[PDB]
């Protein structure tokens, strides 16, 4: 059950937003990565 | 100097990413003594 964000540093699916902060859960690190769609993406191999 | 949770070792990888300023601080050793 889900993904939304990721911790640049301590590697660990977080998921949160607004009044929530912009930090973490078990590394106190202020940098976050958005995380891949599930819409599937296709490539021509050319 | 942080936004809240405050004052922290900075490595260069984060300063780049955070638009930070890879700085250190300066402390002097000051003296009051009296003369007018
Ligand atoms: Zn973290």
UniProtKB/Swiss-Prot annotation, chain A:
Gene Ontology process terms (BP): nucleolar large rRNA transcription by RNA polymerase I; ribosome biogenesis; RNA-templated transcription; termination of RNA polymerase I transcription; termination of RNA polymerase III transcription; transcription by RNA polymerase I; transcription by RNA polymerase II; transcription by RNA polymerase III
GO CC, one annotated term: RNA polymerase I complex
Single GO MF descriptor: zinc ion binding
Keyword vocabulary terms for this entry: DNA-directed RNA polymerase, Metal-binding, Nucleus, Peroxisome, Ribosome biogenesis, Transcription, Zinc, Zinc-finger
Positions annotated to bind Zn(2+): 7, 10, 24, 27
Localization per record: Nucleus, Nucleolus; Peroxisome
PTM annotation: The N-terminus is blocked.
Positions annotated as zinc finger (C4-type): 7-27
Source domain of life: Eukaryota
Subunit (UniProt): Component of the RNA polymerase I (Pol I), RNA polymerase II (Pol II) and RNA polymerase III (Pol III) complexes. Component of the RNA polymerase I (Pol I) complex consisting of 14 subunits: RPA135, RPA190, RPC40, RPA14, RPB5, RPO26, RPA43, RPB8, RPA12, RPB10, RPC19, RPC10, RPA49 and RPA34. The complex is composed of a horseshoe-shaped core containing ten subunits (RPA135, RPA190, RPB5, RPO26, RPB8, RPB10, RPC10, RPA12, RPC19 and RPC40) where RPA135 and RPA190 form the DNA-binding cleft.
Family that this chain belongs to: Belongs to the archaeal Rpo12/eukaryotic RPC10 RNA polymerase subunit family.
Physiological role: DNA-dependent RNA polymerases catalyze the transcription of DNA into RNA using the four ribonucleoside triphosphates as substrates. Common component of RNA polymerases I, II and III which synthesize ribosomal RNA precursors, mRNA precursors and many functional non-coding RNAs, and a small RNAs, such as 5S rRNA and tRNAs, respectively. RNA polymerases are composed of mobile elements that move relative to each other. In Pol II, the core element with the central large cleft comprises RPB3, RBP10, RPB11, RPB12 and regions of RPB1 and RPB2 forming the active center.
Other remarks in the entry: Present with 907 molecules/cell in log phase SD medium.
Designated name of the protein: DNA-directed RNA polymerases I, II, and III subunit RPABC4
Naturally occurring in which organism (per UniProt): Saccharomyces cerevisiae (strain ATCC 204508 / S288c) (Baker's yeast)
Designated gene of the protein: RPC10
Section covered of the full-length record: 25 to 70 of 70
From Swiss-Prot, chain B:
Localization terms from the record: Nucleus
Domain of life of the source: Eukaryota
Leader sequence residues: none
Note: The binding of ribonucleoside triphosphate to the RNA polymerase II transcribing complex probably involves a two-step mechanism. The initial binding seems to occur at the entry (E) site and involves a magnesium ion coordinated by three conserved aspartate residues of the two largest RNA Pol II subunits.
Subunit structure: Component of the RNA polymerase II (Pol II) complex consisting of 12 subunits.
Biological role: DNA-dependent RNA polymerase catalyzes the transcription of DNA into RNA using the four ribonucleoside triphosphates as substrates. Second largest component of RNA polymerases II which synthesizes mRNA precursors and many functional non-coding RNAs. Proposed to contribute to the polymerase catalytic activity and forms the polymerase active center together with the largest subunit. Pol II is the central component of the basal RNA polymerase II transcription machinery.
Membership in a protein family: Belongs to the RNA polymerase beta chain family.
Name by which UniProt lists this protein: DNA-directed RNA polymerase II subunit RPB2
Gene: RPB2
């Amino acid at each position: 059950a889900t993904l939304k964000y990721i911790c640049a540093e301590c590697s660990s699916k977080l998921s949160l937003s607004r009044t929530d902060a912009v930090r973490c859960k078990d590394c106190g690190h202020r940098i976050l990565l958005k995380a891949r769609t599930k819409r599937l993406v296709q490539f021509e191999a050319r | 100097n942080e936004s809240d949770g405050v004052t922290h070792a900075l490595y260069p990888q984060e300063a780049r990413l955070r638009n930070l300023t890879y700085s250190s601080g300066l402390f002097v050793d000051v003296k009051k003594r009296t003369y007018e």
